[PDB]
Design an enzyme around this catalytic site. Structure first.
Site, mmCIF file in Angstrom:
data_model
loop_
_atom_site.group_PDB
_atom_site.id
_atom_site.type_symbol
_atom_site.label_atom_id
_atom_site.label_comp_id
_atom_site.label_asym_id
_atom_site.label_seq_id
_atom_site.Cartn_x
_atom_site.Cartn_y
_atom_site.Cartn_z
ATOM 1 N N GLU A 178 -5.605 -19.569 17.663
ATOM 2 C CA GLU A 178 -7.050 -18.674 18.138
ATOM 3 C C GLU A 178 -7.187 -18.434 18.781
ATOM 4 O O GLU A 178 -6.926 -19.458 19.955
ATOM 5 C CB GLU A 178 -7.274 -20.196 17.541
ATOM 6 C CG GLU A 178 -8.700 -19.401 17.494
ATOM 7 C CD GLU A 178 -9.916 -21.417 16.253
ATOM 8 O OE1 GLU A 178 -9.769 -22.332 16.179
ATOM 9 O OE2 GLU A 178 -11.832 -20.681 16.039
ATOM 10 N N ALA A 181 -4.500 -18.291 22.316
ATOM 11 C CA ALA A 181 -3.688 -19.476 22.129
ATOM 12 C C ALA A 181 -3.483 -20.517 20.911
ATOM 13 O O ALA A 181 -3.711 -20.358 19.847
ATOM 14 C CB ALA A 181 -4.858 -20.515 23.227
ATOM 15 N N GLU A 221 3.341 -24.356 16.859
ATOM 16 C CA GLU A 221 3.098 -24.776 18.007
ATOM 17 C C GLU A 221 1.716 -25.338 18.659
ATOM 18 O O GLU A 221 1.160 -25.398 18.284
ATOM 19 C CB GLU A 221 3.498 -24.376 19.103
ATOM 20 C CG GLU A 221 5.042 -22.812 18.783
ATOM 21 C CD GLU A 221 5.670 -22.367 19.847
ATOM 22 O OE1 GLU A 221 5.612 -23.153 21.164
ATOM 23 O OE2 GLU A 221 5.736 -21.282 19.788
ATOM 24 N N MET A 284 12.554 -22.213 21.644
ATOM 25 C CA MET A 284 12.239 -21.719 22.292
ATOM 26 C C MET A 284 12.706 -21.782 23.562
ATOM 27 O O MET A 284 12.020 -22.519 24.805
ATOM 28 C CB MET A 284 11.096 -21.691 22.780
ATOM 29 C CG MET A 284 10.213 -20.706 22.733
ATOM 30 S SD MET A 284 8.619 -20.735 23.541
ATOM 31 C CE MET A 284 8.033 -21.321 24.987
ATOM 32 N N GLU A 287 11.548 -19.427 29.023
ATOM 33 C CA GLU A 287 10.307 -18.822 29.605
ATOM 34 C C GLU A 287 8.810 -17.744 29.018
ATOM 35 O O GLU A 287 9.005 -16.470 29.573
ATOM 36 C CB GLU A 287 9.613 -19.120 30.702
ATOM 37 C CG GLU A 287 10.646 -20.229 31.629
ATOM 38 C CD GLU A 287 10.037 -21.239 31.537
ATOM 39 O OE1 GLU A 287 8.802 -21.997 31.255
ATOM 40 O OE2 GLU A 287 10.716 -22.631 31.245
ATOM 41 N N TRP A 406 12.552 -11.905 22.196
ATOM 42 C CA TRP A 406 11.471 -11.944 22.583
ATOM 43 C C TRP A 406 11.682 -10.811 23.772
ATOM 44 O O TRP A 406 11.836 -10.882 24.573
ATOM 45 C CB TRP A 406 10.464 -12.662 23.339
ATOM 46 C CG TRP A 406 9.940 -12.854 23.293
ATOM 47 C CD1 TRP A 406 8.829 -12.876 24.471
ATOM 48 C CD2 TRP A 406 7.646 -12.461 21.928
ATOM 49 N NE1 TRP A 406 7.503 -11.860 23.971
ATOM 50 C CE2 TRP A 406 6.822 -12.495 22.775
ATOM 51 C CE3 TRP A 406 8.139 -12.902 20.766
ATOM 52 C CZ2 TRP A 406 6.070 -12.252 21.932
ATOM 53 C CZ3 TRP A 406 6.927 -13.075 20.347
ATOM 54 C CH2 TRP A 406 5.445 -12.036 20.641
#
Length: 429
Positions: A178, A181, A221, A284, A287, A406
């Site tokens: 949202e 973030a 998350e 994940m 960074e 990513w």
């Protein structure tokens, strides 16, 4: 390694002296590596030599039928690969090609495409379509889950077609985001309201059928620690629903190194429970922090060794960055964010500002510092053939499922060369 030839540029090298060394045309090296600087090679720059197999450096005593016995390779294969008689003398210090072992292990590879709040270009899509040859899953980041169970869909551009044409599973990324973030409040609303969960799952299944998404990826998350158990219950509920629709289910995990590690980011992810429920998981392991390697291999290993202690290694896909960062020094918290760059851009910067590329053996990552036209010092950390190969070695050592990237669209030719060199790429469609 043992499946790819990785070469690091040394002082005095030219693209032609490198070509001569490996007895391969310079054009093949330039094309495979998309070299931005073929006449201005940077010391410390790494490239992949595009052949099947790898090179052995000849020693004083060596012969071909010999090298066949010393390795596990047909002598006729070595001879033919080097265009020499089997009884041909071998000059010490020079390289001879050894054909590749017939056996690459299988790997699954996942690519995220960031499309939220963006309009990706035809050029970017062309790149993604090339990448997709090497992928098992791909999809856009993100579908933003709403507190009422509805979904805010990202742009899908041409990703469904790219996935279909390359026999790639189209992947639905669901995130509790949202205002740009992760939101613990959105997490709370969904995980503590069963009606909302039912509405959410209906929207997921409906969207999946409409677009032929075949893996549902939960990237929840920064959940409240209090919602740890609720997340598990929801994932159990989701798993039953999705299996009934012949949909795969995967889950993103915050990087952890122990079971009772505390913190708003980590407590709410029960590795063991999620690992049982999901088809696969993605820790994940990459960074506004200070200059450092993006995914230093020590900390990455720590997270993955913990993951394997909780979750079958065959269910674990490790996260990997395809980008580096350029920091302007001095670093100060709250100030400017580091600039994300492709590894190709990193090479271009070293060439432009006339510095060598260093390699951190501890982090297993390339880096350098340079000075810009305002005499400001920058520090750059990125990725190269060496660093990715080190990660692939870790996948093999820990018997992991594969790697998640990513993000697609970034220019990093060596990554894709090395995937094919090291793995048979799993296709599931």
């Amino acid at each position: 390694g043992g499946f790819a030839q990785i070469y690091t540029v040394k002082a005095g090298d030219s693209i032609y002296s490198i070509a001569k060394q490996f007895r391969i045309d310079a054009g093949k090296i330039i094309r495979a590596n998309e070299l931005p600087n073929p006449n201005q090679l940077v010391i410390g720059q790494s490239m992949v030599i595009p052949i099947n197999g790898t090179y052995y450096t000849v020693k004083a005593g060596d012969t071909i039928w010999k090298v066949g016995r010393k390795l596990g390779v047909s002598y006729q294969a070595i001879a033919n690969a080097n265009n020499v008689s089997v009884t041909a003398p071998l000059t010490p210090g020079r390289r001879i090609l050894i054909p590749p072992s017939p056996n690459k292990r299988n790997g699954e590879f996942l690519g995220y495409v960031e499309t939220s709040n963006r309009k990706i270009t035809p050029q970017t899509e062309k790149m993604i379509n090339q990448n997709a040859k090497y992928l098992t899953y791909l999809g856009p980041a993100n579908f933003e889950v709403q507190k009422d169970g509805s979904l805010k869909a990202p742009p899908l551009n041409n990703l469904g077609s790219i996935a279909k044409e390359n026999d790639v599973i189209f992947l639905m990324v669901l995130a509790n985001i949202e205002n740009g973030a992760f939101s613990d409040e959105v997490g709370r609303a969904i995980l503590n309201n069963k009606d909302v969960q039912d509405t959410l799952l209906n929207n997921i299944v409906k969207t999946a059928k409409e677009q032929n998404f075949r893996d549902i990826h939960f990237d929840f998350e920064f959940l409240r620690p209090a919602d740890k158990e609720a997340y598990i219950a929801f994932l159990q509920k989701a798993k039953k629903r999705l299996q009934d629709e012949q949909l795969l289910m995967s889950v993103a995990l915050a990087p952890k190194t122990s079971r009772d590690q505390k913190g708003k980011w980590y407590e709410a992810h029960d590795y063991k429970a999620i690992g049982e429920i999901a088809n696969f998981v993605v820790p994940m392991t990459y960074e506004g922090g200070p200059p450092m390697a993006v995914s230093p291999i020590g900390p990455v290993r720590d997270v993955l060794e913990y993951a394997v202690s909780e979750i079958p290694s065959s269910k674990i896909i490790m996260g990997q960055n395809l980008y580096g960062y350029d920091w302007t020094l001095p670093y100060k918290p709250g100030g400017e964010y580091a600039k994300a760059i492709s590894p190709q851009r990193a090479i271009e910067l070293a060439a432009r500002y006339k510095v060598a590329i260093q390699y951190d053996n501890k982090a297993q990552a390339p880096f350098f510092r340079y000075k810009d036209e305002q005499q400001r010092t920058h520090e750059v950390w990125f990725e190269d053939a060496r660093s990715i190969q080190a990660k692939f070695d870790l996948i093999k050592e820990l018997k992991l499922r594969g790697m998640a990237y990513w993000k697609l669209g970034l220019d990093f030719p060596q990554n894709w060369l090395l995937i094919e060199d090291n793995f048979k790429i799993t296709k599931r469609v």
